[PDB]
């Protein structure tokens, strides 16, 4: 159904924008860039794979911060248009301590802080790295959550014009969009 948000009560009073800007700055720019993509270090991984998955997950190299992108995702790797993540992006989960993978019961976060589901985003292969899905996820890899913020802002304003990326998680909970969980 519509955009749904889970959040630890640690962040009840934070705006979605302030939370995301802060999380991104922490996670940092992993430098998944030309000549700097290094296997076992900053590539991330797909479940079930190979370069497609219901999940793409990546841990920060500077901390235990990690994200899991979920949906029906495809990555072109070296083939035309190269290094494009496209397909359906349904969810983004943010937190610390990535566990699991393709051999396990999928990727998970030991400490999930915030998750966004029913994002409703699709991008065609045809846009390459100009596609919205690509920009959303690559943004989170490069320490810049602007693209994700823009998508969430649009979804929230469609729910109600008083709601935006600059609304707090508690405000979104009263409006039935978000749901709190104790910090664990």
Cβ atoms 91, 69 nearer than 8 A: yes
Cβ atoms 55, 87 nearer than 8 A: no
Give, as one character, the DSSP assignment of residue 102.
T
- 80: containing domain: 1-184
Question: How much helix, strand and coil, in percent to the nearest 5, is found in the chain?
Answer: 30, 35, 35
Q: Is the dihedral of CA 77, 83, 85, 87 positive or negative?
A: negative
- The CATH number of the domain holding residue 106 is 3.30.1500.10
Residue indicated by tokens 């889970």: 6
Q: Is 83 part of any known ligand binding site? A: yes
Q: Is 75 part of any known ligand binding site? A: yes
What are the residues whose beta carbons fall under 8 Å from the beta carbon of 128, sequence distance 6 or more? Answer: 81, 84, 134
Q: What counts of helices (H) and strands (E) characterise the chain? A: 4, 8
Cα 178–chain centre separation: 16
Q: Which two tokens stand for residue 89?
A: 């992006």
Residue indicated by tokens 């749904």: 4
Q: 155 by DSSP, 3-state: which?
A: helix
Q: How far apart are CA 34 and CA 147, in angstroms?
A: 21
Q: Please name the helix (run of DSSP H) or strand (run of DSSP E) that holds residue 132, with its range, or none.
A: helix 132-141
Cβ atoms 31, 42 nearer than 8 A: yes
Q: Which two tokens stand for residue 175?
A: 């409006």
Cβ atoms 131, 100 nearer than 8 A: no
Give, as one character, the DSSP assignment of residue 51.
S
Total number of domains constituting the chain = 1
Residue indicated by tokens 């083939």: 79
Say how many residues make up the chain. 184
Q: Is 179 part of any known ligand binding site? A: no
Cβ atoms 112, 122 nearer than 8 A: no
Q: Is 35 part of any known ligand binding site? A: yes
Beta-ladder partners of 178: 5
- Write down the experimental method used for this entry: X-ray
Cβ atoms 51, 75 nearer than 8 A: yes
To one decimal, the resolution in angstroms is 1.5
């Amino acid at each position: 159904m519509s955009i749904s948000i889970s959040y630890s009560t640690t962040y009840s009073g934070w705006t979605v924008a302030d939370y995301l800007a802060d999380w991104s700055a922490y996670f940092g720019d992993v430098n998944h860039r030309p000549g700097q993509v290094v296997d076992g270090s900053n590539t991330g991984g797909f479940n079930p794979g190979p370069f497609d998955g219901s999940q793409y997950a990546l841990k920060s190299t500077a901390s235990d911060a990690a994200f899991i992108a979920g949906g029906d995702l495809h990555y072109t790797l070296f083939s035309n248009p190269s290094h494009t993540l496209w397909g359906k992006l349904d969810s983004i989960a943010l937190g610390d301590t990535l566990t699991g993978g393709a051999s396990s019961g999928g990727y998970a976060l030991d400490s999930q802080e915030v998750s966004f589901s029913n994002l409703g985003l699709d991008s065609p292969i045809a846009q390459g790295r100009d596609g919205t899905v690509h920009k959303v996820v690559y943004g989170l890899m490069s320490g810049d959550s602007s693209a994700l913020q823009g998508q969430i802002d649009a979804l929230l304003k469609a729910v109600d014009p008083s709601l935006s990326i600059n609304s707090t998680f508690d405000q979104l909970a009263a409006a039935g969009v978000a749901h709190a969980t104790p910090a664990a």
